[PDB]
Subunit: 324 residues, 4 copies
């Protein structure tokens, strides 16, 4: 059994991460392990709802505002629940990392015992007193991204720029163990995850693309598709990282001013990096997600994730519509 | 702090079950606890896929073949994986119960860390040497039904004909603890669970019904709908038992011979009883599921489950079609 | 590996126990598992003292008062804390067994994190409404005896008259696993367990025996001795079952009325049977413990247990004194 | 619940320890948690005997050789099983701490499911080799043990009292359960290996003889005894409810000044006992003031209720003057 701790040390010896980033990823993994234990207790733990999300915000903020006492090397932190990033305390040393944290992904499933998750992303603080504006970096500047999925088992999935790697929580030991090295997303797929209840709100190339999925063998695609919609992004992506697929949360006309539903800095960029590092693709329908220069901390963006040939197909429907 | 064991003893003192059925439900609860532990280990423990299902068939069949040594009171057992029911060994005392067991519900999710489940149903043996034909009873003759859902928490949901009750596994104690007495499914809902990739294969009233769901506030329904599709029936019904909704797996033309996807005896009937004991409805689109006289052990049937007003609406679409 | 449940089923197939006794031993094992969990939590869980003993009496008497609902087949129960035996409820089926239960052995160690234990003994009820007098049977009439020791690991040690066998609790599974079949106590030893602070109170042969142990190689014994005194009888005897030794709690003059410290029915007889079934000896210093016909349920008796040659030597000192 | 982690952070804000010592105590706590899990599995896990001790030395030396990767701030490490101290790797940053580690205390109990323990001691490296470890016990900046019993408990001092934490097995974290442990000044409980009686020097035999005489002798009260042969377990009882623990000089190996080791056992347990109001003496002098001569020096040990230790010392001083 190859422990996460030995894995991160090997990553330092290979020269892919320094000691500071290894220790920060350790703080996060311990935080996710704490979240895992609370979620695992269900209604017996008191965490089990907007109240469930607030309690995980509490557990997340506590661990992460003491993170520098235990090797976080953080300059600043940004939580999906808060409007602005928060500075690190003066009582502990400051480091050169910006952490973005999504404590509870898949909030509508917290009460109904479907897998939920935590998403995190690590940027570098530009070469002090970092503020909101220091977080506005393209996804390609992430130095680490990952999620922890709380399901029948607890799994940490991470990348530091050299592939995407899955670890399973050994509950007896309280430690993560490497269980899938170098996750690989097959280039093609017959499985799509999209919220089909939003069909009438999508723009035309999006409706044309899905309509062809439905037509299957009887349509231009020549093969039949199947679908899932878990409404935990972490669960849908975890399936895609395991056996391929496409996940889509596109623009829709319900809130026309909103560029999308998922947030660029907290969800699209970290999941996008994991997917690319597993050979997947991560696009808005029209452009590469990781190259967007963010304008605001909480910017929304359409998300097309997964098997790269299928993302390429979906992108083509959009470019062909724009060019018609 | 209300233990499953004490709950069942109260059910006996209340005259709703006898000692034999209480002990069989204890055997089932223990078997689900063991499955829960194996699934919680992920790739570290064993289940981690056809190989995953076979390992769960083995863990289930071992405990269930020694059930009568520990209060099973079983005359015969039928596993969803086996073509035929199996008699219990003569070495241990025989009882008056027929057990239907579905060891792994949601098999396409076993390897991707989404909630899966076990489903079980208890019939009374007619008054010796029962075979497949002794299992062919309408769902209204079930004396017990339930499932165990392996999610971020492990929960056992059960009925013996006096409401539907959810217990959460206390992993420290190894025992189930009552966490929701008298589950109730709201009469109306705005959530549907159906595999929308199969749209082109449905019959017309099914397509008209779903088309109106998609139309939402701009169509005859006057309200917008949201959807999930987890492809673990236990997870979708567990959401409905918690907060309402409708779950549909209808007839489709992909395999025109088959009346449906889900099995009447192993899936529709036990989940149907749980849903009804929580104030929901359980219909084929045209008739009450629990009144069907089964013709074969592995009979398939279309399934419309959940909020009773929404199920009623779906049924109306079909009855109106048959009458036009 | 080899589960306690399967071990007991094999013991039934061999004709050494029936189904009733197997199920009762299961009830006891389950109760010891629950005590084990409470004790493992220390001050965090509840047990942490007379209040500690009372909390264990409560946990024990609760499980044992519903024992016949789960296969206890008990006619009556006697706890060392209670003055008299208690009948089983008429609401549940009555059986043919008398259970003697010592919930907390080594009570002076409960608060200082030294191994403690539970001791139990099973008699058959003579062929209705058994009272204290039905329990007054010689230890040779026990059909089962054992203890559970709560140490750094939890282990159940048991005999049903065919050797003594140790099972280790697998905390992940919640089940006992065979870890030493056919425990054997070496005939000779160099280790003694006695409370040396009571030396001035012992009778003369007892003082000469121990004086010779102290003299070691420079005295008549020709070998040096080492000693322990834990003041948990289960821990001292557990060492003896693992690697030999002698355990002595003799008569003393502090309370001249009292024949000894340990109780014949709750401590001497069950531990004596386990030691004998492991090839050791169990004597009062003058006669075989398991042949004593008890006069009262709480009779005390001196105890010399362990390596049979060493026990024989201790007995010789006393017989030579009585004959001089 | 008050977590060890929050406890250690308050100790830094109070100015009693710095960030380096807090993180090192965290490394040790994690290492003891890992030992605890292995020991809890008994024969089911592997460790359960010299083979048991070696497997625990392996688990211990592995974690401690990467300690500086996780905030050890170690300059060198010394294990009871090894002859000499071991330097820390150059790959990781060096710190200012000397760690002495006793991975398995009470080795004769590892196979028979009686409480065993780990003992540790932290010195500061002067501004490193074996000789750098030769500091009197009064220069320890931290000491403690972890006792693996029915529960797992970490007992610790950093020079401001002695404090017990209980392992919450579900959470994997230590929780404060006895703040400011206090050893009552007097006692009626003694822990000594009575099988060694004929080997003790005269004052030791007279002292024990008077315990046995009890109310019929000069002491005027009756005594009771334990001997667990895990030092951590006997001292843990004393830290909970008083008593005296004695492993004296004896004539079986006359060259050896005692059985227990000064650096790995006597000094750390002595500091915990003193910080709980107890006393820690050789029978003739204060243990924590001894200047060690060698890393593995042995010393007689009299620990616990200070009045009872003082009584034991008086028997010896009177003998040396008679």
């Amino acid at each position: 059994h190859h422990m996460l701790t030995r894995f991160l040390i090997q990553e330092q010896h290979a020269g892919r991460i320094n000691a500071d980033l290894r220790q920060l990823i350790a703080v996060v993994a311990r935080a996710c392990t704490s979240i895992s234990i609370a979620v695992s207790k269900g209604a017996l733990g008191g965490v089990l709802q907007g109240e469930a999300q607030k309690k995980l915000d509490v557990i997340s903020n506590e661990i992460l505002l003491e993170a520098n006492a235990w090797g976080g090397h953080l300059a600043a932190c940004a939580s999906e629940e808060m409007d602005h990033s928060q500075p690190v305390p003066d009582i502990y040393p400051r480091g050169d990392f910006l952490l973005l944290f999504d404590p509870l992904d898949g909030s509508s499933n917290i009460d109904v015992n479907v897998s939920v998750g935590t998403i995190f992303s690590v940027l570098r603080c530009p070469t002090e007193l970092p503020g909101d504006d220091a977080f506005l970096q393209p996804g390609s500047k992430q130095i680490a991204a990952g999620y922890c999925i709380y399901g029948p088992s607890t799994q940490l999935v991470l990348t530091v720029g050299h592939g995407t790697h899955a670890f399973t929580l050994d509950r007896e030991k309280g430690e993560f163990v490497l269980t899938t090295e170098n996750m690989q997303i097959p280039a093609a797929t017959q499985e799509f995850a999209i919220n089909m209840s939003n069909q009438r709100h999508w723009e035309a190339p999006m409706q044309a693309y899905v309509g062809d999925l439905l037509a299957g063998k009887e349509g231009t695609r020549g093969k039949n598709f199947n679908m899932r919609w878990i409404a935990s992004m972490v669960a849908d992506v975890h399936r895609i990282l395991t056996r391929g697929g496409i996940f889509i949360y596109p623009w829709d006309k319900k809130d026309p001013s909103k560029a999308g539903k998922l947030r660029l800095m907290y969800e699209a960029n970290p999941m996008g990096l994991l997917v690319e590092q597993a050979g997947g693709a991560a696009w808005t329908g029209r452009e590469r997600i990781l190259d967007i220069q963010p304008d605001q901390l909480h910017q929304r963006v359409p998300v097309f994730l997964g098997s790269r040939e299928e993302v390429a197909e979906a992108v083509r429907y959009h470019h062909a519509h724009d060019n018609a």
